[PDB]
Design a protein around this ligand. Structure first.
Ligand SMILES: CS(=O)(=O)NCCc1c[nH]c2ccc(OCc3ccccc3)cc12
Length: 199
């Protein structure tokens, strides 16, 4: 799973409507591990970078998701992001999304979501969230590249860092690093979740 004893990711998708096609999707063998030092360079060595955050800890909060996104779908159309987390504790969440292009942070989006009681547990729904202009434009350019290897080339410099903290205590609950390639249309979107380690 992508989660800890305290907070667990349930579903994550990015999509276009318009007024659904999913570019990437996580619905929910231990879990392979990746040494965080390998991806230090795909994120800023600045405040709120992978290096900085991992140093505070707890190490078990950190995950890598590699995405093979489906970009086969011209101008619409509702572009959106949906996340759903769950816990057994009642919290409010502060979710920070940092989009990075060549190590540098080009976008940060901070959102807050309160626990909702449902089915003997707390669910945190951040559904139908507008995709920022930057991502829409970027996707619209990327879909036009003639070769999937050129999308892969363009994507090797593009990463997202998602930091979920307990809004009242400032403790870190979940830190997911995203890295990207493209999938074909017959293979469909795919992902591989990893745990980040250092030892
Ligand atoms: C909520 S926000 O708009 O403020 N920022 C977005 C937050 C976000 C976290 N993880 C993601 C994974 C993928 C994605 O777009 C799909 C996709 C992107 C790039 C190439 C191919 C496909 C957006 C996100």
């Amino acid at each position: 799973g992508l989660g800890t004893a305290r907070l667990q990711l349930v579903e994550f998708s990015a999509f276009v409507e318009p007024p659904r096609h999913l570019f990437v999707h996580i619905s929910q063998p231990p879990l392979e591990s990746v040494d965080v030092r390998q991806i230090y360079d795909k994120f800023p060595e600045k405040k709120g970078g992978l290096r900085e955050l991992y140093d505070r800890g707890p190490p078990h909060a950190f995950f890598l998701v590699k995405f093979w996104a489906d970009l086969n779908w011209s101008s619409g159309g509702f572009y959106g992001v949906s996340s759903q987390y769950e816990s057994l504790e009642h919290m409010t969440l502060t979710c920070s999304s940092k989009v990075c292009s060549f190590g540098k942070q080009v976008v940060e989006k901070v959102e807050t979501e309160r626990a909702q009681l449902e089915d003997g547990r707390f669910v945190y729904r951040l559904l139908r969230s507008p995709m920022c202009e930057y991502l829409v434009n970027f996707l619209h350019k990327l879909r036009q590249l003639p070769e999937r290897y050129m999308m892969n080339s363009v994507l090797e410099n593009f990463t997202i860092l998602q930091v979920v903290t307990n809004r009242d205590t400032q403790e870190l609950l979940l830190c997911t690093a995203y890295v990207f390639e493209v999938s074909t249309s017959e293979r469909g979107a795919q992902h591989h979740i990893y745990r980040l380690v250092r030892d």
